[PDB]
Amino acid sequence: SMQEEDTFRELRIFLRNVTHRLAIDKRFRVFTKPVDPDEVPDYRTVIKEPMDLSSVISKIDLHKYLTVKDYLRDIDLICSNALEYNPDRDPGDRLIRHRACALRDTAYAIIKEELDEDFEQLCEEIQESR
Numbered sequence: 378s379m380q381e382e383d384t385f386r387e388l389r390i391f392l393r394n395v396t397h398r399l400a401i402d403k404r405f406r407v408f409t410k411p412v413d414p415d416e417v418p419d420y421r422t423v424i425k426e427p428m429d430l431s432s433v434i435s436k437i438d439l440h441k442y443l444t445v446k447d448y449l450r451d452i453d454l455i456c457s458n459a460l461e462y463n464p465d466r467d468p469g470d471r472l473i474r475h476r477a478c479a480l481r482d483t484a485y486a487i488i489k490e491e492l493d494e495d496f497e498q499l500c501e502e503i504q505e506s507r
């Protein structure tokens with residue numbers, strides 16, 4: 378229905394706003410673009426599903442996310458990719474792990490404060506009807 382297409386258009390507006398708030402934070406710069414295969418040719422042999430905040434906006438605009446749950450699976454993938462590629466005790470690996478955990482915690486905190494649970498349940502029920 379038109380009403381259902383309006384619901385998904387409101388979900389995309391919400392997700393673009395959360396994503397741009399994460400992308401402007403200086404802590405999260407390393408997560409804003411894909412890893413450059415030139416600088417890091419080993420990356421795509423270790424990490425089987427790369428993800429970054431520029432790819433997430435592209436996916437919002439392609440109508441890939443029908444629920445906030447499917448958006449948070451990609452935020453969780455950005456974080457888990459950083460934890461698995463950079464697991465060592467040295468300061469450069471510990472700094473990117475701390476930033477990855479902060480990106481995940483910040484996204485979940487904005488959603489807890491600003492997403493209405495009944496709006497998410499409506500999106501889930503339209504998705505399950507299709």
Ligand SMILES: CCN1CCN=CC[C@]1(CC)C(=O)NCc1ccccc1
Pocket residue numbers: 489490491492493494
């Ligand atoms: C966690 C529950 N939250 C969020 C869901 N939305 C309405 C209810 C409530 C309170 C019960 C709230 O008012 N949070 C404030 C807020 C709402 C929208 C945008 C920004 C901030």
